[PDB]
Amino acid sequence: AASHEERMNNYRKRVGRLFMEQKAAQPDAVKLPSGLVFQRIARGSGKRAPAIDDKCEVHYTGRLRDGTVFDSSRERGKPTTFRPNEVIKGWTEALQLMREGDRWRLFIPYDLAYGVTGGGGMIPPYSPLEFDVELISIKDGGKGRTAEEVDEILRKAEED
């Protein structure tokens, strides 16, 4: 029907918004001004976050709001190499706030993920994404923010 696409995407935006809001409501979840939400799973001992162009070794799992896994380095049995500028916006932001050994759960609203069109395959329009992201190591140990810089950004975010 004529208004079918609109109504379906209205449904998608509603349950997607429900997902994001419930995840943000978790007391230890932190919401950044961009809309990115994260939860720390483990605190790493690394001294530096990656710069935007640093190659990172990452173990991750990506799930939809209903738990469906759409991508996972663990199913492949080895980490994947990423630069923060190669991946979706939510990842780009998060990686630059992570140090070696950090493991975070990310809740990424659609506009920082695959947006209105979706990934074109198993990620439909207006999908928030959940990732479990472990930053294993960084080429040359990392050339981005210092741990102290990262922690101060996070501390202020928490307080706002």
Side-chain angles (χ1 to χ4, degrees), residues 36-77:
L36 175 70
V37 182
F38 70 92
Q39 221 170 3
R40 313 164 171 89
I41 301 168
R43 294 179 180 261
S45 286
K47 284 190 298 186
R48 295 278 292 216
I52 186 77
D53 61 355
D54 274 331
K55 291 180 56 178
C56 303
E57 303 313 308
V58 177
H59 250 320
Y60 69 100
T61 303
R63 311 199 153 239
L64 306 184
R65 63 188 170 74
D66 72 344
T68 298
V69 168
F70 57 85
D71 190 15
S72 165
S73 63
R74 302 196 186 267
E75 287 188 45
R76 301 188 291 261

Side-chain angles (χ1 to χ4, degrees), residues 86-146:
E86 285 170 348
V87 291
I88 59 174
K89 274 190 216 191
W91 270 53
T92 304
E93 193 179 0
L95 284 168
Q96 290 178 93
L97 294 163
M98 292 175 73
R99 70 213 79 185
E100 165 178 358
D102 281 342
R103 191 172 167 175
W104 285 10
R105 206 166 281 116
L106 310 178
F107 309 98
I108 310 182
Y110 75 93
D111 47 301
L112 302 174
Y114 292 102
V116 179
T117 80
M122 68 191 294
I123 300 172
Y126 298 106
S127 287
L129 305 182
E130 166 179 341
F131 289 86
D132 181 333
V133 184
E134 182 180 12
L135 180 50
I136 298 171
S137 70
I138 314 163
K139 178 175 302 328
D140 263 315
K143 302 264 177 338
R145 292 176 179 114
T146 60

